[PDB]
Amino acid sequence: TVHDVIIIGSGPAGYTAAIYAARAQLKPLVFEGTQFGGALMTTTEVENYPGFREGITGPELMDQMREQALRFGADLRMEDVDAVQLEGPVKTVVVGDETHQARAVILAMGAAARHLGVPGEEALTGMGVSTCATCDGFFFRDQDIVVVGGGDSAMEEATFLTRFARSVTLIHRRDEFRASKIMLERARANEKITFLTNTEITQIEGDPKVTGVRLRDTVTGEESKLDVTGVFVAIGHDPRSELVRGQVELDDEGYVKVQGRTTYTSLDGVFAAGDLVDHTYRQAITAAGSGCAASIDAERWLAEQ
Amino acid sequence: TVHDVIIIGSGPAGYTAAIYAARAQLKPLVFEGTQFGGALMTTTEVENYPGFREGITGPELMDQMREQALRFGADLRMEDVDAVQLEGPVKTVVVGDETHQARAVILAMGAAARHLGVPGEEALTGMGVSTCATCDGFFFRDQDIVVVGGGDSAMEEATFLTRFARSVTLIHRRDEFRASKIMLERARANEKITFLTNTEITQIEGDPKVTGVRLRDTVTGEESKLDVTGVFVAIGHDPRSELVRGQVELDDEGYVKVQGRTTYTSLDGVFAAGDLVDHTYRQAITAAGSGCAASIDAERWLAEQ
Ligand SMILES: Cc1cc2nc3c(=O)[nH]c(=O)nc-3n(C[C@H](O)[C@H](O)[C@H](O)COP(=O)(O)OP(=O)(O)OC[C@H]3O[C@@H](n4cnc5c(N)ncnc54)[C@H](O)[C@@H]3O)c2cc1C
Ligand SMILES: Cc1cc2nc3c(=O)[nH]c(=O)nc-3n(C[C@H](O)[C@H](O)[C@H](O)COP(=O)(O)OP(=O)(O)OC[C@H]3O[C@@H](n4cnc5c(N)ncnc54)[C@H](O)[C@@H]3O)c2cc1C
Ligand SMILES: [Mg+2]
Ligand SMILES: [Mg+2]
């Protein structure tokens, strides 16, 4: 059995591709992962996804998307793809000890936000810990918060957040910043931003919501506690391109490269959508739009075979 | 009063840009038009917009989007922009005899699908008349339908539709086709497609839904009636770039050109989203994703000023 299309991933990109492919009668086979539903499964209220005047939670939105795909005939499997063979007329994915094949593959594995890896970080996610100023900055009006990171991302998150927050403490584990000089001086010019270099968070405190961070100086080991009600982690993203490295062309940071304004990768019959590709916008609505595009690309490409 | 951003248009691109800009505290001023709400205001059920497991009507979805923008502080005006001055640090839009100014402008005027311009076409829209095989092809299973057009669009719509329809009659007012030879031969190879050249529709019949089309031979004037329950118009699209012609760079078909995978136009501080730019995918979810991108671009650009 060679399917028309296999989709790898179950965030907004993968489920939108599945909805379109299923409605196009392609009978898409979708590997969602065991940690299915994408990044929004791991947040609370989603307010900037257009179509919900009063908002919707991440899990509620993603279940709508999943049920929508099912309604149109998508074959959803809550399992991880462990290896792929993407070159040639028939592509293979390996799922544990099972194999599945298809004429086209849509890559929608997303990107992982890098974690601090400290106690409290996971528990308090959506309760004061965030990875996305655009998404949750809104909810920290007049509060004292921290941003963690030393790159342009962190500089952009910190400066953007000062339009809501009472104060922003920008923490970085070294005394040198990889951020561009322009972003660095923008943050230095901001009166609401204080820098804490050679500093790391060792723990995030909070009974139901974030109440403080435990800090350590990375040179002297001196520890202290800072009272804050928000922690924004901005230490980078890791596109989930491990499966396809060596097969499809990646840029220097591991993002899957695509042709022009399409979803075509360097490999015939292989298409890529979402934050696996996009290192600029990184929103649910942009990932959903790209997943639709990937399925239209795949449909058009299949028609030419 | 110079606003941070003015948005022109109120389809998915314009309302998504408004939601993001308003939530970013930019207080966007949005000119929706008198025919507000975009193309979906002019359809019935929308089934492929991710997030609605049982679907939603076009007007219901667009009202959610409008109310969402309002909730976050967008200033919405149900009026047409009649002229723009887009060059320089301060942009001006003219609305009747009123003027409004802004540092950034987001162009989201969309594209008009070309109409047959015959009696019945407008009345039966969403009741058997469609402009979008991807969107409504689903609903014509085992039915006899027509597709109108002579280009690649029409060839793609007709061939795609044969996976649902019992038959497809492809009508074109000349005996020569502007479609590429590959698309033309794909349709000629399809056993479910019959060509009717030198033929035009003069009227679409239907008590509540489409029941037939009146046909005329464009050479001899011979008229007849065809029994069909669907009409797909695929005679092209006209991007609504009239306002900005001579100011922002357009391609040969009038679409606004953008830089790379961003929404930046040829003019500093001017950004473009949706079907005004995209002549490839033309879906609500892709237009919404691009409107989000336009507002993130605009936010980032404003921050650099
Ligand atoms: C905490 C948090 C809050 C956010 N809040 C918002 C918000 O309010 N608004 C907004 O617009 N955006 C928000 N975002 C961003 C948004 O969630 C992402 O931009 C979007 O989900 C990216 O979609 P994607 O489909 O490309 O990837 P992802 O969402 O990362 O989804 C990819 C999925 O595919 C699975 N997968 C990966 N590899 C495999 C494999 N080999 N086999 C099987 N499955 C696999 C993953 O486990 C994951 O479930 C938030 C992100 C985070 C982390
Ligand atoms: C009948 C029909 C059914 C469809 N069904 C579906 C479907 O089921 N699923 C799907 O994904 N897509 C569907 N589409 C396509 C989808 O509607 C479009 O791709 C999408 O709406 C494009 O969004 P946009 O914001 O770029 O432009 P548009 O939707 O065209 O919106 C632009 C808006 O801006 C206004 N505007 C323009 N110029 C000015 C001005 N000078 N001043 C003020 N306002 C102005 C316009 O009047 C319009 O209201 C359908 C389209 C049609 C025509
Ligand atoms: Mg996840
Ligand atoms: Mg309209």
Numbering used by the authors:
A (entry chain A), B (entry chain A): 6 to 310
How is this structure described in the published paper?
Here, we present the result of a crystallographic fragment screening on M. smegmatis thioredoxin reductase (Msm-TrxR) as a model for Mtb-TrxR. These two proteins show a sequence identity of 77% and high structural similarity, with a root-mean-square deviation (r.m.s.d.) of 0.879 Å. Therefore, different initial crystal hits for Msm-TrxR were tested and optimized. Optimized crystals were fully grown after three days in crystallization buffer with 10% glycerol and were stable after soaking in buffer containing an additional 5% DMSO for more than 3 h. As a model organism for Mtb, crystals of Mycobacterium smegmatis TrxR that diffracted to high resolution were used in crystallographic fragment screening to discover binding fragments and new binding sites. The fragments are bound to 11 binding sites, of which four are positioned at binding pockets or important interaction sites and therefore show high potential for possible inhibition of TrxR.
As part of the thioredoxin system, thioredoxin reductase (TrxR) is essential for the survival of Mycobacterium tuberculosis (Mtb) and shows substantial differences from human TrxR, making it a promising and most likely selective target. TrxR is composed of a NADPH-binding domain and a FAD-binding domain. While FAD is tightly bound to the protein, NADPH acts as an electron donor and is easily exchanged. However, while the TrxRs from higher eukaryotes contain a C-terminal active-site motif that interacts with the substrate Trx, prokaryotic TrxRs depend on a conformational change between an oxidized (FO) and a reduced (FR) conformation.
